Amino acid sequence: ASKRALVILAKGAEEMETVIPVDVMRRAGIKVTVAGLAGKDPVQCSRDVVICPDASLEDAKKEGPYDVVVLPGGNLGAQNLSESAAVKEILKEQENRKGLIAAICAGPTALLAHEIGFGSKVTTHPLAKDKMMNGGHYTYSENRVEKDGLILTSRGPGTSFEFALAIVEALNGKEVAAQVKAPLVLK
Amino acid sequence: ASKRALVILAKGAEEMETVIPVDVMRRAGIKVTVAGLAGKDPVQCSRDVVICPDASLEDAKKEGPYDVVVLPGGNLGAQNLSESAAVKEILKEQENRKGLIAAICAGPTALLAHEIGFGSKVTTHPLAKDKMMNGGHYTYSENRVEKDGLILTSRGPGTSFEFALAIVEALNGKEVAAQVKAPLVLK
Numbered sequence: 001a002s003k004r005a006l007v008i009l010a011k012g013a014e015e016m017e018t019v020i021p022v023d024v025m026r027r028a029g030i031k032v033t034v035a036g037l038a039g040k041d042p043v044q045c046s047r048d049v050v051i052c053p054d055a056s057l058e059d060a061k062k063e064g065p066y067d068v069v070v071l072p073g074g075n076l077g078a079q080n081l082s083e084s085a086a087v088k089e090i091l092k093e094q095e096n097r098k099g100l101i102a103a104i105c106a107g108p109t110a111l112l113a114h115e116i117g118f119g120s121k122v123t124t125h126p127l128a129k130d131k132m133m134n135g136g137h138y139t140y141s142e143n144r145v146e147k148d149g150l151i152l153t154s155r156g157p158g159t160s161f162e163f164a165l166a167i168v169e170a171l172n173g174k175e176v177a178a179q180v181k182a183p184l185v186l187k
Numbered sequence: 188a189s190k191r192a193l194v195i196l197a198k199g200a201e202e203m204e205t206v207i208p209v210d211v212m213r214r215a216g217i218k219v220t221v222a223g224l225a226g227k228d229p230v231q232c233s234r235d236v237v238i239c240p241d242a243s244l245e246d247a248k249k250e251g252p253y254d255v256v257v258l259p260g261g262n263l264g265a266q267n268l269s270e271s272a273a274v275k276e277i278l279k280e281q282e283n284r285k286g287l288i289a290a291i292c293a294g295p296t297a298l299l300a301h302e303i304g305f306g307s308k309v310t311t312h313p314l315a316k317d318k319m320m321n322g323g324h325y326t327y328s329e330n331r332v333e334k335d336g337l338i339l340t341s342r343g344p345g346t347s348f349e350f351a352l353a354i355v356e357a358l359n360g361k362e363v364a365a366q367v368k369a370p371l372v373l374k
């Protein structure tokens with residue numbers, strides 16, 4: 001049976017960090033739900049790209065649980081994720097059930113906000129390090145992608161393909177990740 | 188004064204190849220118009236990401252001309268661009284006025300369809316080479332980004348950052364491209 005991904009899309013999300021994982025995961029045969037934090041309406045991303053979510057978060061939650069919950073970055077998107085009681089509940093449920101959580105750029109700071117995966121080795125965007133490390137709840141890494149058990153983190157738009165393919169490898173295996181990678185013309 | 192970019196968005200466009208250049212160009216302070224080929228309505232991309240264009244092509248044309256016209260790939264998106272009389276007219280005008288034209292993945296095959304930039308060195312996605320080379324109107328390159336004067340081409344999702352930054356360098360210079368690049372966490 002196919003694996004399922006929930007991508008939580010908030011105003012101010014980094015659109016590259018949203019679209020790259022959604023696209024790459026669909027290439028891998030993952031069933032991806034782009035879920036709007038604020039409802040069903042189109043979402044204005046950080047660089048003004050407007051994306052129409054597949055569903056509201058409220059609705060997508062009802063079709064859970066998911067094999068991965070994906071948190072894009074963007075400072076303002078991550079703040080919105082960080083402030084959301086609905087995200088808190090989703091992430092706590094996912095952690096509790098030992099499901100994967102993946103977050104990129106400023107996205108990992110939402111893990112801090114919601115007290116998720118304390119003790120993990122994580123990375124973030126370099127500019128988000130101090131926020132992530134407030135209280136020393138995680139151990140910091142400069143790896144482009146960091147995976148510490150069920151906590152998978154990455155750094156920025158330029159690591160989005162690696163992040164996405166790490167998600168694919170985690171859910172569908174190395175061979176599928178390699179197959180999906182080759183047509184992308186990655187360096 | 189700020190440079191201006193027209194990104195032509197058709198059904199079946201590769202969403203990564205659309206969003207990466209739009210975002211990176213906006214980071215560079217370029218005024219970018221995402222123009223829907225079919226009108227003002229949301230566009231269903233190749234991997235089902237739905238993007239709301241800033242304007243119809245019809246409307247965006249009226250605010251021309253642009254310092255660059257950008258053609259994303261995706262096989263079906265490129266076919267739609269290739270079949271469009273409106274795109275033909277836009278590209279001929281751009282070529283005639285010696286403005287930049289940039290196309291990625293299968294996007295360059297629209298240049299062939301509309302008889303644009305014959306004689307140029309070009310690249311495409313590897314799977315789009317034979318289509319592009321039908322009649323030997325161009326010279327083929329395996330460079331990740333190829334720029335032959337005002338014809339700028341690239342290969343796939345994995346070359347989208349390089350493609351975008353090449354556009355930025357062409358319009359705004361090497362120093363701006365370097366400044367925009369550094370926060371992206373590119374390899």
Ligand SMILES: *[C@@]1(=O)C(=O)N([C][C]C2=[C][C]=[C][C]=[C]2)C2=[C][C]=C(F)[C]=C21
Nearest residue numbers: 014073074075105106127128370371
């Ligand atoms: C990335 O998508 C993101 O989340 N970034 C924000 C990092 C940050 C900046 C200031 C304070 C806290 C966090 C970010 C920045 C730059 C970039 F290119 C991508 C991203």
Ligand SMILES: *[C@@]1(=O)C(=O)N([C][C]C2=[C][C]=[C][C]=[C]2)C2=[C][C]=C(F)[C]=C21
Nearest residue numbers: 183184201260261262292293314315
């Ligand atoms: C890319 O975005 C694109 O346009 N691709 C289509 C290439 C092509 C395939 C078959 C026949 C003609 C052209 C393509 C393919 C794979 C990929 F990963 C990205 C793109």
Ligand SMILES: [Cl-]
Nearest residue numbers: 046074075076
């Ligand atoms: Cl940001």
Ligand SMILES: [Cl-]
Nearest residue numbers: 233261262263
């Ligand atoms: Cl395609």
